[PDB]
mmCIF file of C-alpha atoms in Angstrom:
data_model
loop_
_atom_site.group_PDB
_atom_site.id
_atom_site.type_symbol
_atom_site.label_atom_id
_atom_site.label_comp_id
_atom_site.label_asym_id
_atom_site.label_seq_id
_atom_site.Cartn_x
_atom_site.Cartn_y
_atom_site.Cartn_z
ATOM 1 C CA UNK A 1 0.000 0.000 0.000
ATOM 2 C CA UNK A 2 2.662 2.477 -1.099
ATOM 3 C CA UNK A 3 1.038 4.060 -4.147
ATOM 4 C CA UNK A 4 2.726 7.419 -4.833
ATOM 5 C CA UNK A 5 0.413 10.052 -6.260
ATOM 6 C CA UNK A 6 2.429 11.453 -9.197
ATOM 7 C CA UNK A 7 0.789 14.796 -8.381
ATOM 8 C CA UNK A 8 3.084 15.026 -5.342
ATOM 9 C CA UNK A 9 5.585 17.842 -5.718
ATOM 10 C CA UNK A 10 9.303 17.204 -5.409
ATOM 11 C CA UNK A 11 10.411 20.807 -5.975
ATOM 12 C CA UNK A 12 8.050 23.406 -4.520
ATOM 13 C CA UNK A 13 9.990 26.282 -6.219
ATOM 14 C CA UNK A 14 9.096 28.289 -3.095
ATOM 15 C CA UNK A 15 10.646 27.052 0.123
ATOM 16 C CA UNK A 16 8.852 26.249 3.346
ATOM 17 C CA UNK A 17 6.971 29.496 3.857
ATOM 18 C CA UNK A 18 7.986 31.373 6.981
ATOM 19 C CA UNK A 19 4.575 32.163 8.474
ATOM 20 C CA UNK A 20 2.269 29.131 8.308
ATOM 21 C CA UNK A 21 -1.333 29.925 9.228
ATOM 22 C CA UNK A 22 -3.211 26.924 10.546
ATOM 23 C CA UNK A 23 -6.893 27.431 9.853
ATOM 24 C CA UNK A 24 -7.549 31.000 11.015
ATOM 25 C CA UNK A 25 -4.655 31.048 13.506
ATOM 26 C CA UNK A 26 -2.266 33.404 11.692
ATOM 27 C CA UNK A 27 0.983 33.509 13.690
ATOM 28 C CA UNK A 28 2.102 37.022 14.449
ATOM 29 C CA UNK A 29 5.486 38.735 14.682
ATOM 30 C CA UNK A 30 5.912 42.298 15.841
ATOM 31 C CA UNK A 31 7.366 44.836 13.424
ATOM 32 C CA UNK A 32 10.448 45.141 15.636
ATOM 33 C CA UNK A 33 11.151 41.432 16.090
ATOM 34 C CA UNK A 34 13.539 39.420 13.945
ATOM 35 C CA UNK A 35 12.830 35.912 12.686
ATOM 36 C CA UNK A 36 15.315 34.288 10.348
ATOM 37 C CA UNK A 37 14.217 33.247 6.842
ATOM 38 C CA UNK A 38 14.746 29.539 7.489
ATOM 39 C CA UNK A 39 12.628 29.496 10.639
ATOM 40 C CA UNK A 40 9.099 28.071 10.471
ATOM 41 C CA UNK A 41 6.378 29.762 12.539
ATOM 42 C CA UNK A 42 3.303 27.534 12.329
ATOM 43 C CA UNK A 43 0.030 28.136 14.122
ATOM 44 C CA UNK A 44 -0.356 29.957 17.444
ATOM 45 C CA UNK A 45 3.069 31.569 17.764
ATOM 46 C CA UNK A 46 3.537 35.199 18.761
ATOM 47 C CA UNK A 47 6.861 37.032 18.747
ATOM 48 C CA UNK A 48 6.498 40.067 20.977
ATOM 49 C CA UNK A 49 8.245 43.261 20.071
ATOM 50 C CA UNK A 50 11.980 42.773 20.193
ATOM 51 C CA UNK A 51 12.570 39.047 20.227
ATOM 52 C CA UNK A 52 14.780 37.115 17.845
ATOM 53 C CA UNK A 53 14.334 33.595 16.463
ATOM 54 C CA UNK A 54 17.622 32.700 14.830
ATOM 55 C CA UNK A 55 18.299 30.587 11.716
ATOM 56 C CA UNK A 56 17.233 26.977 11.512
ATOM 57 C CA UNK A 57 14.455 26.981 14.102
ATOM 58 C CA UNK A 58 10.885 25.735 14.295
ATOM 59 C CA UNK A 59 7.939 26.892 16.411
ATOM 60 C CA UNK A 60 4.722 25.008 15.694
ATOM 61 C CA UNK A 61 2.176 26.034 18.279
ATOM 62 C CA UNK A 62 -0.605 23.917 16.814
ATOM 63 C CA UNK A 63 -1.829 22.425 20.097
ATOM 64 C CA UNK A 64 -1.514 25.498 22.331
ATOM 65 C CA UNK A 65 0.052 28.957 22.381
ATOM 66 C CA UNK A 66 3.738 29.827 22.238
ATOM 67 C CA UNK A 67 4.696 33.396 23.022
ATOM 68 C CA UNK A 68 8.169 34.943 23.009
ATOM 69 C CA UNK A 69 8.421 37.995 25.247
ATOM 70 C CA UNK A 70 10.009 41.404 25.055
ATOM 71 C CA UNK A 71 13.586 40.886 23.870
ATOM 72 C CA UNK A 72 14.005 37.165 24.383
ATOM 73 C CA UNK A 73 16.065 35.145 21.963
ATOM 74 C CA UNK A 74 15.666 31.599 20.703
ATOM 75 C CA UNK A 75 18.924 30.392 19.199
ATOM 76 C CA UNK A 76 19.673 28.360 16.119
ATOM 77 C CA UNK A 77 18.137 24.885 16.032
ATOM 78 C CA UNK A 78 15.532 25.301 18.741
ATOM 79 C CA UNK A 79 12.228 23.470 18.479
ATOM 80 C CA UNK A 80 9.218 24.706 20.441
ATOM 81 C CA UNK A 81 6.157 22.476 20.211
ATOM 82 C CA UNK A 82 3.158 22.819 22.534
ATOM 83 C CA UNK A 83 2.367 19.485 24.189
ATOM 84 C CA UNK A 84 -0.954 17.663 24.286
ATOM 85 C CA UNK A 85 -4.337 18.918 25.402
ATOM 86 C CA UNK B 1 19.702 79.304 3.523
ATOM 87 C CA UNK B 2 16.009 79.205 4.375
ATOM 88 C CA UNK B 3 15.345 76.265 2.062
ATOM 89 C CA UNK B 4 18.184 74.316 3.675
ATOM 90 C CA UNK B 5 16.735 74.781 7.156
ATOM 91 C CA UNK B 6 13.371 73.718 5.778
ATOM 92 C CA UNK B 7 14.828 70.615 4.149
ATOM 93 C CA UNK B 8 16.678 69.550 7.286
ATOM 94 C CA UNK B 9 13.491 70.140 9.268
ATOM 95 C CA UNK B 10 11.470 67.950 6.934
ATOM 96 C CA UNK B 11 14.052 65.183 7.006
ATOM 97 C CA UNK B 12 14.188 65.280 10.790
ATOM 98 C CA UNK B 13 10.416 65.167 11.120
ATOM 99 C CA UNK B 14 10.205 62.247 8.713
ATOM 100 C CA UNK B 15 12.870 60.285 10.574
ATOM 101 C CA UNK B 16 10.875 61.068 13.706
ATOM 102 C CA UNK B 17 7.615 59.750 12.265
ATOM 103 C CA UNK B 18 9.489 56.639 11.182
ATOM 104 C CA UNK B 19 11.011 56.195 14.637
ATOM 105 C CA UNK B 20 7.817 56.516 16.690
ATOM 106 C CA UNK B 21 6.454 53.317 15.213
ATOM 107 C CA UNK B 22 9.349 51.016 15.861
ATOM 108 C CA UNK B 23 10.182 50.343 12.200
ATOM 109 C CA UNK B 24 13.691 51.484 11.227
ATOM 110 C CA UNK B 25 14.676 55.058 10.529
ATOM 111 C CA UNK B 26 14.820 55.102 6.727
ATOM 112 C CA UNK B 27 11.967 52.723 6.000
ATOM 113 C CA UNK B 28 10.689 54.387 2.820
ATOM 114 C CA UNK B 29 13.765 56.230 1.548
ATOM 115 C CA UNK B 30 11.571 57.907 -1.057
ATOM 116 C CA UNK B 31 9.409 59.644 1.516
ATOM 117 C CA UNK B 32 12.370 61.530 2.980
ATOM 118 C CA UNK B 33 12.679 63.573 -0.207
ATOM 119 C CA UNK B 34 9.002 64.525 0.046
ATOM 120 C CA UNK B 35 9.612 65.467 3.664
ATOM 121 C CA UNK B 36 12.547 67.674 2.710
ATOM 122 C CA UNK B 37 10.475 69.324 0.002
ATOM 123 C CA UNK B 38 7.538 70.022 2.290
ATOM 124 C CA UNK B 39 9.795 71.400 5.007
ATOM 125 C CA UNK B 40 11.600 73.657 2.551
ATOM 126 C CA UNK B 41 8.421 75.063 1.031
ATOM 127 C CA UNK B 42 6.916 75.495 4.493
ATOM 128 C CA UNK B 43 9.815 77.485 5.930
ATOM 129 C CA UNK B 44 10.124 79.626 2.806
ATOM 130 C CA UNK B 45 6.416 80.453 2.821
ATOM 131 C CA UNK B 46 6.544 81.114 6.559
ATOM 132 C CA UNK B 47 9.242 83.741 6.094
ATOM 133 C CA UNK B 48 7.279 85.297 3.227
ATOM 134 C CA UNK B 49 4.102 85.430 5.299
ATOM 135 C CA UNK B 50 5.893 86.872 8.326
ATOM 136 C CA UNK B 51 7.244 89.694 6.181
ATOM 137 C CA UNK B 52 3.774 90.331 4.768
ATOM 138 C CA UNK B 53 2.076 90.399 8.158
ATOM 139 C CA UNK B 54 4.740 92.728 9.543
ATOM 140 C CA UNK B 55 4.001 95.089 6.668
ATOM 141 C CA UNK B 56 0.253 94.955 7.321
ATOM 142 C CA UNK B 57 0.719 95.438 11.062
ATOM 143 C CA UNK B 58 2.903 98.481 10.454
ATOM 144 C CA UNK B 59 0.263 99.933 8.137
ATOM 145 C CA UNK B 60 -2.391 99.287 10.787
ATOM 146 C CA UNK B 61 -0.270 101.036 13.413
ATOM 147 C CA UNK B 62 0.256 104.001 11.086
ATOM 148 C CA UNK B 63 -3.515 104.227 10.679
ATOM 149 C CA UNK B 64 -3.949 103.956 14.452
ATOM 150 C CA UNK B 65 -1.642 106.973 14.716
ATOM 151 C CA UNK B 66 -4.337 109.068 13.033
ATOM 152 C CA UNK B 67 -7.026 107.689 15.361
ATOM 153 C CA UNK B 68 -5.040 109.154 18.270
ATOM 154 C CA UNK B 69 -3.714 112.210 16.409
ATOM 155 C CA UNK B 70 -7.187 113.784 16.502
ATOM 156 C CA UNK B 71 -7.220 112.927 20.227
ATOM 157 C CA UNK B 72 -4.145 114.929 21.324
#
């Protein structure tokens, strides 16, 4: 049972988009904050006014909220993933 | 020199308006020229209008001289 749908993309020509809304849960960065271009902000993530999420990081708050404060920093390969219900 | 003071004033005010909201100083580097232009024209017209109103005030005072000349 391993049928590959040939309509599956193998080169998206547009990388993993930075800000991934998850059904009316548009993650929000403040105009002062700095997220890298590699980082992936999916779901209920908020970056509050001076924080920095450095290259190669992932924040998928799809179960709960994840909120980075005033000038906090989350370094390179961090992974923040809200736990279960 | 008036236009230079006006231009510097416009540039300063535009950098200000770009600094209040935390976005960087020269966010739209094509607004700053509009700011310089508006500041220049404003200061030039302000000097012109001050000269004009001084002239009118001096005429009004000269006419007030006659209102008190008949007083004596």
